[PDB]
PDB file of N, CA, C and O in Angstrom:
ATOM      1  N   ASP V   1     101.926  99.455 114.794  1.00 55.68           N
ATOM      2  CA  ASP V   1     102.660 101.140 114.657  1.00 55.68           C
ATOM      3  C   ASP V   1     103.032 101.287 113.021  1.00 55.68           C
ATOM      4  O   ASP V   1     102.648 100.676 112.478  1.00 55.68           O
ATOM      5  N   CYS V   2     103.605 102.685 113.158  1.00 54.21           N
ATOM      6  CA  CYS V   2     103.836 102.717 111.636  1.00 54.21           C
ATOM      7  C   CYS V   2     104.944 102.357 111.049  1.00 54.21           C
ATOM      8  O   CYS V   2     106.169 102.637 111.886  1.00 54.21           O
ATOM      9  N   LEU V   3     105.013 102.259 109.662  1.00 56.04           N
ATOM     10  CA  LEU V   3     106.125 102.033 108.926  1.00 56.04           C
ATOM     11  C   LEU V   3     106.862 102.815 108.668  1.00 56.04           C
ATOM     12  O   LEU V   3     106.625 104.027 108.687  1.00 56.04           O
ATOM     13  N   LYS V   4     107.836 102.934 109.300  1.00 52.17           N
ATOM     14  CA  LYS V   4     108.850 104.038 109.236  1.00 52.17           C
ATOM     15  C   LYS V   4     109.862 104.342 108.148  1.00 52.17           C
ATOM     16  O   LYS V   4     109.518 103.886 107.064  1.00 52.17           O
ATOM     17  N   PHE V   5     110.747 105.257 108.033  1.00 52.35           N
ATOM     18  CA  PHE V   5     111.501 105.654 106.689  1.00 52.35           C
ATOM     19  C   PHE V   5     112.196 104.575 106.469  1.00 52.35           C
ATOM     20  O   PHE V   5     113.032 104.089 107.140  1.00 52.35           O
ATOM     21  N   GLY V   6     111.936 103.848 104.998  1.00 55.19           N
ATOM     22  CA  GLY V   6     112.752 102.941 104.851  1.00 55.19           C
ATOM     23  C   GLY V   6     112.274 101.580 104.924  1.00 55.19           C
ATOM     24  O   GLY V   6     112.363 100.537 104.112  1.00 55.19           O
ATOM     25  N   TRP V   7     110.864 101.710 105.208  1.00 56.78           N
ATOM     26  CA  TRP V   7     110.142 100.361 105.652  1.00 56.78           C
ATOM     27  C   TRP V   7     109.286 100.060 104.328  1.00 56.78           C
ATOM     28  O   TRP V   7     108.696 100.828 103.762  1.00 56.78           O
ATOM     29  N   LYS V   8     109.622  98.711 104.177  1.00 54.75           N
ATOM     30  CA  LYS V   8     108.866  98.138 103.098  1.00 54.75           C
ATOM     31  C   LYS V   8     107.302  98.248 103.105  1.00 54.75           C
ATOM     32  O   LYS V   8     106.631  98.066 104.059  1.00 54.75           O
ATOM     33  N   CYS V   9     106.190  98.573 102.385  1.00 55.53           N
ATOM     34  CA  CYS V   9     104.854  98.895 102.492  1.00 55.53           C
ATOM     35  C   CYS V   9     104.408  98.383 100.987  1.00 55.53           C
ATOM     36  O   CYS V   9     104.846  97.911 100.457  1.00 55.53           O
ATOM     37  N   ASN V  10     103.148  98.213 101.026  1.00 52.73           N
ATOM     38  CA  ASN V  10     102.492  98.107  99.691  1.00 52.73           C
ATOM     39  C   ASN V  10     101.586  99.473  99.502  1.00 52.73           C
ATOM     40  O   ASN V  10     100.986  99.602 100.333  1.00 52.73           O
ATOM     41  N   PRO V  11     101.843 100.146  98.025  1.00 56.84           N
ATOM     42  CA  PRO V  11     101.486 101.335  97.562  1.00 56.84           C
ATOM     43  C   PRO V  11      99.856 101.566  97.748  1.00 56.84           C
ATOM     44  O   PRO V  11      99.251 102.750  98.050  1.00 56.84           O
ATOM     45  N   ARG V  12      99.103 100.504  98.045  1.00 57.94           N
ATOM     46  CA  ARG V  12      97.603 100.455  98.303  1.00 57.94           C
ATOM     47  C   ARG V  12      97.292 101.004  99.721  1.00 57.94           C
ATOM     48  O   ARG V  12      96.172 101.451  99.774  1.00 57.94           O
ATOM     49  N   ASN V  13      98.141 100.269 100.227  1.00 57.91           N
ATOM     50  CA  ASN V  13      97.665 100.081 101.810  1.00 57.91           C
ATOM     51  C   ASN V  13      98.717 101.298 102.479  1.00 57.91           C
ATOM     52  O   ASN V  13      99.564 100.684 102.911  1.00 57.91           O
ATOM     53  N   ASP V  14      99.035 102.381 102.826  1.00 55.08           N
ATOM     54  CA  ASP V  14      99.853 103.075 102.911  1.00 55.08           C
ATOM     55  C   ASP V  14      99.353 103.106 104.924  1.00 55.08           C
ATOM     56  O   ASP V  14      98.609 103.210 105.766  1.00 55.08           O
ATOM     57  N   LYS V  15     100.671 102.952 105.416  1.00 52.27           N
ATOM     58  CA  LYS V  15     100.760 101.941 106.862  1.00 52.27           C
ATOM     59  C   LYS V  15     101.627 102.940 107.389  1.00 52.27           C
ATOM     60  O   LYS V  15     102.692 102.899 108.625  1.00 52.27           O
ATOM     61  N   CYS V  16     102.432 103.755 106.591  1.00 51.38           N
ATOM     62  CA  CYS V  16     103.605 104.984 106.786  1.00 51.38           C
ATOM     63  C   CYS V  16     103.117 105.716 107.990  1.00 51.38           C
ATOM     64  O   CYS V  16     102.092 106.376 107.843  1.00 51.38           O
ATOM     65  N   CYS V  17     104.444 106.009 108.818  1.00 50.38           N
ATOM     66  CA  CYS V  17     104.146 107.461 109.561  1.00 50.38           C
ATOM     67  C   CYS V  17     103.794 108.320 109.615  1.00 50.38           C
ATOM     68  O   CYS V  17     103.951 108.724 108.109  1.00 50.38           O
ATOM     69  N   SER V  18     103.630 109.493 109.985  1.00 53.09           N
ATOM     70  CA  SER V  18     102.635 110.674 109.796  1.00 53.09           C
ATOM     71  C   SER V  18     103.857 111.680 109.227  1.00 53.09           C
ATOM     72  O   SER V  18     105.043 111.937 109.444  1.00 53.09           O
ATOM     73  N   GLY V  19     103.599 111.940 107.963  1.00 55.09           N
ATOM     74  CA  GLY V  19     104.593 112.612 107.267  1.00 55.09           C
ATOM     75  C   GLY V  19     105.611 111.587 106.224  1.00 55.09           C
ATOM     76  O   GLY V  19     106.352 112.391 105.426  1.00 55.09           O
ATOM     77  N   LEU V  20     104.946 110.803 106.129  1.00 56.39           N
ATOM     78  CA  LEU V  20     106.080 109.690 105.619  1.00 56.39           C
ATOM     79  C   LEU V  20     104.953 108.880 104.664  1.00 56.39           C
ATOM     80  O   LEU V  20     103.514 108.744 105.324  1.00 56.39           O
ATOM     81  N   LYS V  21     105.437 108.724 103.365  1.00 55.55           N
ATOM     82  CA  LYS V  21     104.332 108.059 102.434  1.00 55.55           C
ATOM     83  C   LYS V  21     104.703 107.030 101.798  1.00 55.55           C
ATOM     84  O   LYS V  21     106.124 106.970 101.451  1.00 55.55           O
ATOM     85  N   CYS V  22     103.860 105.826 101.650  1.00 51.52           N
ATOM     86  CA  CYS V  22     104.435 104.919 100.754  1.00 51.52           C
ATOM     87  C   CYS V  22     104.566 104.982  99.331  1.00 51.52           C
ATOM     88  O   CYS V  22     103.472 105.633  98.705  1.00 51.52           O
ATOM     89  N   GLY V  23     105.540 105.059  98.642  1.00 50.18           N
ATOM     90  CA  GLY V  23     105.943 105.470  97.381  1.00 50.18           C
ATOM     91  C   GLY V  23     104.920 104.480  96.377  1.00 50.18           C
ATOM     92  O   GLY V  23     104.988 103.083  96.601  1.00 50.18           O
ATOM     93  N   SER V  24     104.382 105.076  95.184  1.00 49.80           N
ATOM     94  CA  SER V  24     103.799 104.218  94.292  1.00 49.80           C
ATOM     95  C   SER V  24     104.491 103.401  93.509  1.00 49.80           C
ATOM     96  O   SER V  24     104.610 102.517  92.971  1.00 49.80           O
ATOM     97  N   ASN V  25     105.516 104.125  93.156  1.00 48.25           N
ATOM     98  CA  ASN V  25     106.737 103.310  92.483  1.00 48.25           C
ATOM     99  C   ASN V  25     107.747 102.820  92.879  1.00 48.25           C
ATOM    100  O   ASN V  25     108.619 102.757  92.634  1.00 48.25           O
ATOM    101  N   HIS V  26     107.376 102.944  94.300  1.00 47.29           N
ATOM    102  CA  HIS V  26     108.543 102.360  95.314  1.00 47.29           C
ATOM    103  C   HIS V  26     108.251 101.366  95.814  1.00 47.29           C
ATOM    104  O   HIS V  26     106.702 100.383  95.403  1.00 47.29           O
ATOM    105  N   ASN V  27     108.916 100.684  97.121  1.00 49.41           N
ATOM    106  CA  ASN V  27     107.830  99.687  97.524  1.00 49.41           C
ATOM    107  C   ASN V  27     108.150  99.783  99.150  1.00 49.41           C
ATOM    108  O   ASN V  27     107.906  98.934 100.282  1.00 49.41           O
ATOM    109  N   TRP V  28     108.644 100.943  99.361  1.00 48.89           N
ATOM    110  CA  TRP V  28     108.966 101.420 100.490  1.00 48.89           C
ATOM    111  C   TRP V  28     108.372 103.166 101.169  1.00 48.89           C
ATOM    112  O   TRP V  28     107.942 103.681 100.445  1.00 48.89           O
ATOM    113  N   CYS V  29     108.464 103.378 102.309  1.00 44.50           N
ATOM    114  CA  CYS V  29     108.135 104.279 103.201  1.00 44.50           C
ATOM    115  C   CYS V  29     109.020 105.687 102.656  1.00 44.50           C
ATOM    116  O   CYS V  29     110.342 105.104 103.134  1.00 44.50           O
ATOM    117  N   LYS V  30     108.681 106.495 102.185  1.00 47.31           N
ATOM    118  CA  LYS V  30     109.716 107.681 101.734  1.00 47.31           C
ATOM    119  C   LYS V  30     108.848 109.208 102.369  1.00 47.31           C
ATOM    120  O   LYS V  30     107.908 108.562 102.639  1.00 47.31           O
ATOM    121  N   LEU V  31     109.715 109.983 102.352  1.00 48.56           N
ATOM    122  CA  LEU V  31     109.274 111.214 102.692  1.00 48.56           C
ATOM    123  C   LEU V  31     108.371 112.099 102.032  1.00 48.56           C
ATOM    124  O   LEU V  31     108.710 111.964 100.799  1.00 48.56           O
ATOM    125  N   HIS V  32     107.153 112.303 102.481  1.00 47.37           N
ATOM    126  CA  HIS V  32     106.072 112.591 102.011  1.00 47.37           C
ATOM    127  C   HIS V  32     106.108 114.209 101.013  1.00 47.37           C
ATOM    128  O   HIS V  32     106.583 115.118 102.111  1.00 47.37           O
ATOM    129  N   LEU V  33     106.033 114.189 100.191  1.00 48.02           N
ATOM    130  CA  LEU V  33     106.274 115.547  99.552  1.00 48.02           C
ATOM    131  C   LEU V  33     105.437 115.839  98.131  1.00 48.02           C
ATOM    132  O   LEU V  33     104.426 116.094  98.339  1.00 48.02           O
TER     133      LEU V  33
END
């Protein structure tokens, strides 16, 4: 399933939910803007 808001991710492999993005300077899924 997709990584949800606040879920820890790896910036190279975005597995965050639709509209949500793994932040490059972060380590978690934040709202895509």
